[PDB]
Amino acid sequence: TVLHVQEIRDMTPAEREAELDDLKTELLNARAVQAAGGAPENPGRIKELRKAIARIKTIQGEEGD
């Protein structure tokens, strides 16, 4: 959602990897707030981050890296 398709393609081979490692870290700091019984969650997002990483990797392979 907060990250669309075209945009993933407009990036350079290095930006996908940079953004991927940015989201991977947010998703990782997400599972920690949850594993900590945390309540300030926003359920839709922890789901999105997963689907975003899919979209990014899906495109990485599509562009030849």
Partner RNA sequence: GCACGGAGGCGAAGAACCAUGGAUUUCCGAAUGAGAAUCUCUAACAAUUGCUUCGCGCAAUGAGGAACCCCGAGAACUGAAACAUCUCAGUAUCGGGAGGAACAGAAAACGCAAUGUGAUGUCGUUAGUAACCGCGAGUGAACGCGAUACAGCCCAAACC
Partner RNA sequence: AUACAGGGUGACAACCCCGUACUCGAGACCAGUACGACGUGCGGUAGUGCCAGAGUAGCGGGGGUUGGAUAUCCCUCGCGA
Partner RNA sequence: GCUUUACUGCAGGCUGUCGCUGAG
- Within 10 angstroms of residue 48's Cβ, the number of other Cβ atoms is 17
User: If contact means CB under 5 to 8 A according to the sort of partner, which of RNA, other proteins, none does residue 26 touch?
Assistant: none
Among 10, 12, 21, 35, binds other proteins (CB under 8 A): 35
Q: At its nearest, how many Å lie between other proteins and the CB of residue 11?
A: 20
2 near RNA (CB under 7 A): yes
Q: Which residue has the tokens 């075209």?
A: 6
Which residue type does 29 have? N
Do residues 55 and 5 make contact, with C-beta atoms less than 8 angstroms apart? Answer: yes
Binding site for RNA (CB under 7 A): 1-2, 4, 6-7, 42-45, 47-48, 58, 61
